[PDB]
Amino acid sequence: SGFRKMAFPSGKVEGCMVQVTCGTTTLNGLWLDDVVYCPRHVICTSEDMLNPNYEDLLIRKSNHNFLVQAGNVQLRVIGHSMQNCVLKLKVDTANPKTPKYKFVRIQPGQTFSVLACYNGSPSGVYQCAMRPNFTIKGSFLNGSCGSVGFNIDYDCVSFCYMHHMELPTGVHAGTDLEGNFYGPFVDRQTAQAAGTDTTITVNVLAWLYAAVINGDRWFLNRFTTTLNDFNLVAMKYNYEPLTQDHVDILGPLSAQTGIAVLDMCASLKELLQNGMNGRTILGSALLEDEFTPFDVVRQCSGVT
Amino acid sequence: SGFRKMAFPSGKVEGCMVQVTCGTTTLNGLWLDDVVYCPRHVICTSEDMLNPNYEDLLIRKSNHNFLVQAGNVQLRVIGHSMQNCVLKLKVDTANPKTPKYKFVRIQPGQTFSVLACYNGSPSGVYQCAMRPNFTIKGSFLNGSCGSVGFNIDYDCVSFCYMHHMELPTGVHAGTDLEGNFYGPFVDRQTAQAAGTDTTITVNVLAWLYAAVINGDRWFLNRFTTTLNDFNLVAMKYNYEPLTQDHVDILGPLSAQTGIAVLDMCASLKELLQNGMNGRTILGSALLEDEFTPFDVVRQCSGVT
Numbered sequence: 157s158g159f160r161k162m163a164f165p166s167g168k169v170e171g172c173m174v175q176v177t178c179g180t181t182t183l184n185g186l187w188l189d190d191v192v193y194c195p196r197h198v199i200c201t202s203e204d205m206l207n208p209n210y211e212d213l214l215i216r217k218s219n220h221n222f223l224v225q226a227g228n229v230q231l232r233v234i235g236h237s238m239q240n241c242v243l244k245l246k247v248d249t250a251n252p253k254t255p256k257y258k259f260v261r262i263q264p265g266q267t268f269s270v271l272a273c274y275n276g277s278p279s280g281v282y283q284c285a286m287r288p289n290f291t292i293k294g295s296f297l298n299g300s301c302g303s304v305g306f307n308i309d310y311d312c313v314s315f316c317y318m319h320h321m322e323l324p325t326g327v328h329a330g331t332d333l334e335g336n337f338y339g340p341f342v343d344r345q346t347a348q349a350a351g352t353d354t355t356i357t358v359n360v361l362a363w364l365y366a367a368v369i370n371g372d373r374w375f376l377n378r379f380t381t382t383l384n385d386f387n388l389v390a391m392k393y394n395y396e397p398l399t400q401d402h403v404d405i406l407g408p409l410s411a412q413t414g415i416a417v418l419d420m421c422a423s424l425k426e427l428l429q430n431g432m433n434g435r436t437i438l439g440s441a442l443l444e445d446e447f448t449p450f451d452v453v454r455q456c457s458g459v460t
Numbered sequence: 461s462g463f464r465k466m467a468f469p470s471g472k473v474e475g476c477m478v479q480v481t482c483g484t485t486t487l488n489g490l491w492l493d494d495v496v497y498c499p500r501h502v503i504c505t506s507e508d509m510l511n512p513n514y515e516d517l518l519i520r521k522s523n524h525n526f527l528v529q530a531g532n533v534q535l536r537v538i539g540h541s542m543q544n545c546v547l548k549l550k551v552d553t554a555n556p557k558t559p560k561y562k563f564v565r566i567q568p569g570q571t572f573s574v575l576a577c578y579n580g581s582p583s584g585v586y587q588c589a590m591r592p593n594f595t596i597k598g599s600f601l602n603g604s605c606g607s608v609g610f611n612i613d614y615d616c617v618s619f620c621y622m623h624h625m626e627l628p629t630g631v632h633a634g635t636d637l638e639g640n641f642y643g644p645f646v647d648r649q650t651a652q653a654a655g656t657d658t659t660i661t662v663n664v665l666a667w668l669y670a671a672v673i674n675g676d677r678w679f680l681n682r683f684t685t686t687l688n689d690f691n692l693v694a695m696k697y698n699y700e701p702l703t704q705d706h707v708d709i710l711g712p713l714s715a716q717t718g719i720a721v722l723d724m725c726a727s728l729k730e731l732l733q734n735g736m737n738g739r740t741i742l743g744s745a746l747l748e749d750e751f752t753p754f755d756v757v758r759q760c761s762g763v764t
């Protein structure tokens with residue numbers, strides 16, 4: 157028992173981190189097979205970051221201008237190209253530690269582990285969620301760019317995120333591994349609006365089932381609700397509207413605990429309307445939305 | 461910016477995890493050099509767990525009765541011995557992936573990363589703290605025994621914890637890597653009292669400095685306090701008494717923010733006396749005590 161904001165073991169991703177330098181700028185790179193992926197702003201200087209013309213800037217760069225270092229050994233760059241907001245540096249050596257992997261574009265609400273890096277070296281790993289507004293509430297400093305978000309299914313690493321920037325609001329923005337930004341964000345040092353962030357209702361419900369599994373049952377009530385009635389409450393509290401798709405994915409947790417999805421929604425409704433009253437659920441004084449129903453099942457059953 | 465419950469990258473510890481079987485019991489083992497460390501209850505059956513006579517049970521076990529498996533390959537056991545509550549299985553092969561390492565016995569209040577394992581395979585990594593009462597609030601299921609807690613200083617892994625049992629209360633108990641339990645706990649399936657748990661005051665103060673560094677400053681007040689006055693409040697709220705030693709370790713954070721340690725104590729005093737009033741600090745609705753002053757400095761400066 158016990159429930160934690162658990163990240164995936166980062167070993168497979170650690171063996172992929174490299175340092176990429178270009179001019180005065182240094183950031184992290186992702187070495188899979190004979191290719192190094194990194195944010196395209198590695199080619200920019202501080203004057204450029206206001207409104208960089210990446211196509212013009214990259215034209216002044218040759219393969220030799222990109223310094224790729226794995227540990228303390230140098231990688232020979234034999235090719236370079238831009239794909240959306242990432243650079244793919246073709247190197248003459250395949251990464252001997254390249255795990256089985258996929259490039260995946262996640263949906264908002266889904267979660268992933270971030271391996272935060274500086275100068276190609278790992279500093280820490282944490283679990284986070286793609287917010288409904290396509291930002292992440294990470295922990296990143298200057299030089300963290302190029303750090304990646306991932307998921308792991310037995311031996312396959314699905315890379316889903318690459319960190320690019322911190323918005324003036326303190327939240328983080330980045331791309332999938334094809335360099336397409338999540339959300340409306342552009343890689344420019346400019347004021348950018350993130351959407352209104354909503355709470356991931358299906359994840360809060362999954363976390364309430366995780367609380368029941370682990371003994372925290374005070375919030376269970378004698379009530380039930382409908383999807384429509386629940387969503388009237390969710391709308392008011394800026395919670396994502398619950399669909400039959402969300403109810404279906406909560407099916408295994410509902411079966412495990414014997415608590416119907418709509419009865420759990422009724423508990424969530426009372427929690428939203430009356431607060432926690434100074435109490436806690438799984439060591440938290442607020443409703444947690446960063447565990448998907450999949451994360452709950454995985455953690456409570458010990459999937460390796 | 462941003463602050464997360466970050467764990468150490470687990471790669472160096474992943475390469476050390478093995479599966480250890482003895483009779484019907486299987487748990488995790490830690491392979492460093494030519495030695496495999498695991499909990500001594502691997503030699504027990506369900507009847508034994510009530511009051512096991514480990515010295516008598518181990519006498520019925522030969523090197524061949526201990527099945528050690530790293531990935532899918534078997535390790536030949538050439539020796540076995542008991543040290544307190546751990547078994548040290550001498551194997552004929554040194555772990556090729558053994559990192560630089562130390563065995564350390566942590567103090568309560570200190571933090572560490574846990575790499576939770578099942579059948580020798582890693583399932584996840586999370587950051588946790590040794591509670592003042594010597595228990596950990598982990599996330600562990602049956603088969604997680606043998607999973608280790610560690611810290612990393614550049615390239616050296618300091619192993620500080622080995623998971624042994626879950627108390628009937630749902631909290632977790634274990635040993636250092638010499639097999640000495642933290643706290644009064646014994647490796648028996650019996651009702652055991654954990655101490656009254658207190659909040660780690662120096663860690664809450666470190667986390668309030670982390671909030672200030674990252675923009676959350678609403679809790680800063682026009683007040684100051686004394687160590688004695690503060691401790692009268694800490695006593696009432698079951699917070700650890702603050703000493704000049706704790707004040708000294710908060711020195712770097714005090715210097716970084718320009719907020720005197722005692723002024724921060726006064727903010728904590730008002731927070732304890734008046735609650736959060738529905739507000740949050742670093743995405744939390746309660747006072748977080750699982751980040752040491754060292755963890756705050758490391759995270760806010762990007763130590764790799």
Ligand SMILES: Cc1ccncc1CC(=O)Nc1cccc(Cl)c1
Nearest residue numbers: 197296297298320321322343344345
């Ligand atoms: C300072 C920091 C903190 C966290 N994560 C990243 C950073 C650096 C950063 O924001 N870079 C940046 C800024 C605007 C545009 C672009 Cl392309 C990149």
Ligand SMILES: Cc1ccncc1CC(=O)Nc1cccc(Cl)c1
Nearest residue numbers: 501600601602624625626647648649
């Ligand atoms: C079921 C579980 C959940 C979390 N962590 C561990 C476990 C197994 C467990 O508690 N083992 C145990 C019990 C009493 C004594 C001793 Cl020696 C070992």
